[PDB]
Write a protein that binds this ligand. Structure first.
Ligand SMILES: Nc1ncnc2c1ncn2[C@@H]1O[C@H](COP(=O)(O)CP(=O)(O)OP(=O)(O)O)[C@@H](O)[C@H]1O
Ligand SMILES: Nc1ncnc2c1ncn2[C@@H]1O[C@H](COP(=O)(O)CP(=O)(O)OP(=O)(O)O)[C@@H](O)[C@H]1O
Ligand SMILES: Nc1ncnc2c1ncn2[C@@H]1O[C@H](COP(=O)(O)CP(=O)(O)OP(=O)(O)O)[C@@H](O)[C@H]1O
Ligand SMILES: Nc1ncnc2c1ncn2[C@@H]1O[C@H](COP(=O)(O)CP(=O)(O)OP(=O)(O)O)[C@@H](O)[C@H]1O
Ligand SMILES: [Mg+2]
Ligand SMILES: [Mg+2]
Ligand SMILES: [Mg+2]
Ligand SMILES: [Mg+2]
Lengths: 193, 195, 193, 195
């Protein structure tokens, strides 16, 4: 019964990920056409696993139903935009939000206000129209925009998360020196363009 | 020259148009299968016109050799071909796509209802599509050739007769065309009844 | 326990499908390079679902273990080569078997000896070396080679299989007239090359 | 001429070589992750040399402008770049690939152990690969550039300094190179300990 509703959820949010991905790749493709630089290194897509969706609903004391999840959970559809340089992150943000049918919903900038452990990434939730066979759906998609250095750090830290406390200090040490080397590559890249 | 640059610009933006068309179409196919357990689309082929065939077509129509003329007058710069599993899937795809707010019909030629003299059959619609670029919006036409697998199989062989040698197989092609429609009608009739 | 063995099975037979697919596409790509014709229309790959694998093992009274399935089941890895013309089928067969590291295991030609219901397809099982991280595996892969007409017929018939008996007769009727129209396209295509 | 045809032949067969190399490499990456829950490869890039850059390289080395010479003397006609997640993954990929019966080492240059003067770092191996064509077998060389993500990030920026402007950033590049190796050493050291 309810499970059908969640299967429906997985399907339409997968479609949302397709329309965003096409938008993003066109922006990357056109920017390189004009300025001979690719802002995007690569992208990863993911529809939230159901058991993680149910876990998150319970952590927030919410009902286990697809319509509740559709309301309260904004990262059912997630895309991760790994960029080549630090300024490419905000370039992607500007290019996408300027589009008529893209609506900002949430913005959390962990680059300028990093988490305690050193995590850095730009998180924006945007709305996207998805034209289905017999219906239109405007669905939220969480976009994690980051540099390659931020991505490699987040990968190592993710795989850890009672073994976090040991490496917590020098992970933050790595985080810091990743930002410093990427700052230096950015300043060089800024100057050659 | 500046023009050749213009044609490179043309190839780039019409390639992007094909990306947005393809995502729309595959979502429709994916959602229809989700609801009704049937895939209207068998496969799709994309193509941006070669510059050298684009220049040929401009000259064949007595038009100027410029990107601004080509954008206006040539509607098959971006081409997508939607090969469908059954004949009724063709018009289903058309209906589903045109009802979308940002897709506008521009040209329609129904060679299924009114086949060509040689037996060619296909639905040809040109639609307009918004393409959001880095610093600009472009609304671009895309020619969609919607057809069955049988129609595709026939059109491939006929295309490979050309390139004074069409007259020989003209009759024997017209027979293949006819018997393709007849067998596909019957598979359509069976598929309708079991759904 | 045993389930681990079947997970291992799925992984290595998936890799087998990758090496075959690369072989087949190179052959198709080279044939078109030389003769300006593409024998292959498209291909579908599939590793057998486990519950269907366990079902098949029970139907044959065999043990439910990965090593037994690896021996007795030759269609764990399946690839389907849908060809443009009838003669392309045997062209693909010739091109692939001539390769040094491809070994024929089983051949059943349902084109010349169609099944009672009208099914037609060339079925060959071949062996393929798969170089893994720390080990080599020579694995069987079932190849179903057919025309587009044979494929469309098989699709309609598969989806139906107590409702087979009704359409059984005119399915065979369709089967026959598919072969006749494809014969005529073949004779024309033979003559233009 | 007949030659230009020869170079078209060259592009075709070396593209096929890249397909067999890629399938081997991805299977190794896929199997290693299956066993040890780690992906050595982050991503891969493929490339067949442009004919016009191939002609340039032949002239730079005083060689004849023919496909038969290029096949013999130029080993980076087919190029693949294996970007790895950690430094030790680089040599792991090399070991796994060369131990295969039908892969033969042809050339090896280890710029990781002996970096270039500007700070470039990467493992360069040319290997031979059998390519089974429709009517013929070809054993073709493929140049493999194996590197970390940091090495890739650095090499991209340095490549975009060229194309009398390298001297300015030469020192500041050499620093970036160094601190990339140092941060990647530490991430390697952490990753080793948690496995
Ligand atoms: N926007 C995003 N896009 C692509 N992948 C993402 C992503 N967010 C997380 N991932 C990755 O998807 C995998 C599974 O994530 P989940 O457990 O389902 C949600 P989460 O990462 O815990 O975010 P949450 O804390 O907001 O709920 C993780 O390994 C993560 O790295
Ligand atoms: N909408 C479309 N979708 C997919 N492929 C198409 C297509 N239109 C043409 N093609 C294919 O592109 C290849 C080269 O033909 P082109 O010159 O580019 C267009 P055309 O078919 O010649 O239209 P034209 O007769 O008005 O000039 C052909 O193989 C053709 O089948
Ligand atoms: N060699 C093959 N390659 C690709 N797909 C195949 C295939 N053989 C069968 N399929 C398709 O895979 C889907 C699931 O097949 P399965 O039920 O797992 C085995 P099967 O089709 O019953 O063959 P079997 O009777 O020899 O056991 C079917 O819909 C089928 O059309
Ligand atoms: N093994 C390889 N794998 C992936 N990309 C490669 C590659 N070798 C070169 N490339 C890329 O191909 C693009 C054009 O360079 P090419 O002229 O084709 C070869 P090259 O790097 O100039 O070698 P060369 O200096 O010996 O001539 C560059 O962006 C380069 O990074
Ligand atoms: Mg999240
Ligand atoms: Mg046209
Ligand atoms: Mg089978
Ligand atoms: Mg080189």
């Amino acid at each position: 019964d309810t499970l059908l509703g969640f299967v429906e959820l997985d399907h339409i949010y997968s479609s949302a990920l397709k329309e965003i991905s096409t938008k993003l790749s066109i922006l990357d493709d056109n920017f390189n056409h004009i300025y001979k630089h690719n802002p995007i290194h690569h992208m990863e897509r993911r529809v939230k696993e159901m058991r993680s969706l149910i876990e998150k609903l319970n952590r927030k004391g919410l009902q286990i139903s697809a319509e509740t999840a559709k309301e309260h959970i904004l990262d059912i559809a997630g895309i991760r935009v790994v960029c080549n340089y630090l300024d490419d992150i905000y370039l992607i943000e500007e290019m996408l939000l300027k589009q008529e049918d893209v609506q900002l919903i949430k913005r959390k900038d962990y680059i300028q206000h990093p988490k305690e452990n050193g995590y850095r990434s730009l998180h924006i939730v945007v709305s996207i129209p998805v034209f289905l066979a017999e219906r239109v759906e405007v669905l939220p998609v969480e976009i994690q925009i980051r540099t390659i250095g931020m991505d490699m750090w987040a990968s190592l830290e993710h795989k850890i998360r009672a073994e976090t406390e040991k490496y917590r200090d020098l992970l933050k040490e790595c985080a810091t020196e990743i930002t410093e080397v990427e700052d230096k590559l950015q300043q060089i890249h800024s100057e050659i363009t």
